[PDB]
Each structure stands twice: as C-alpha cells, then as structure tokens.
C-alpha cells in the first residue's frame, strides 16, 4: 500500500503505486512511479511519474509529463508541460512540450501529431 491517499476516490480496477493523490477521482486506471495527482480525474488512464492538477485525463497515458487545469482525451504525452488546454484525437502523440492554453511553444524537441489542440 505504497500509495499515499488523501480523500481521493481510486476504483478497485484502478492502481496507485509509489505516488500521491489529493482529491483525486481514479477509475479504471493507473496512478504509477511517483505520480503525484490533485483533484483530477482519470478516466481509463495511465499515469506515470507525472503530475496533474485540476486536470481531466481520458483513455490517455501521460508520462513524465505535469498537468495544470487541462483535458486529454485519447492522447498520449510525454515529457510535457500543459497549463489550461483541452487535448483530443484518437490518435493524438505529444512529447517534449510546453502547452499553455492550446498554443504550443515551438521547440525542436517537442513534436506533436494527430492532435487537436484548444484553451480552457
């Protein structure tokens, strides 16, 4: 029981190991590899050594990558940074980006494809 829950609401499908969840509503998903999860909700989601705030994640894996009051449905992510933006597409793939209310700061490292990027 490596997870440290603070009034947050984890599903038995769902797993959270080695991290931290405040007010975190978790179902059907995982919460892994010091994550650290406040008031968000994941929805089918995978969650590794990432942090979210005020954040809504659906059917995504998010990795290495912090969350702040955004929404990726269906989308994968990496080593990322999103502040206020609403993510989306089947086939949505970010990695190595700073996204701040659907503009994504142009970077070399950062490559994003299949997404559909907006403000919250």
């Known amino acids: 029981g490596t997870c440290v829950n603070t009034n947050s609401q984890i599903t ?3 797993q959270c190991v080695k991290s931290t969840a ?9 919460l892994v590899d010091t994550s650290i999860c406040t008031r968000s909700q994941y929805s089918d ?10 954040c809504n994640i659906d059917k995504s ?8 009051g955004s929404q990726y449905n269906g989308i994968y992510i ?5 502040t206020g933006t609403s993510i989306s597409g089947p086939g949505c793939s970010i990695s190595t980006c700073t996204i ?3 503009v994504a700061t142009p970077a070399a490292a950062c490559k994003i494809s ?7």
């Open 78 to 82: 990496r080593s990322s940074t999103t």
């Open 45 to 54: 989601a995978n969650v590794k050594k990432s942090v979210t705030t005020d």
């Open 114 to 120: 299949g997404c559909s990027l907006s403000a919250m």
């Open 61 to 68: 894996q998010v990795y290495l990558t912090t969350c702040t």
């Open 22 to 30: 405040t007010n975190c509503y978790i179902d059907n998903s995982q």
């Open 12 to 14: 038995a499908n769902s």
């Open 100 to 102: 701040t209310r659907g």
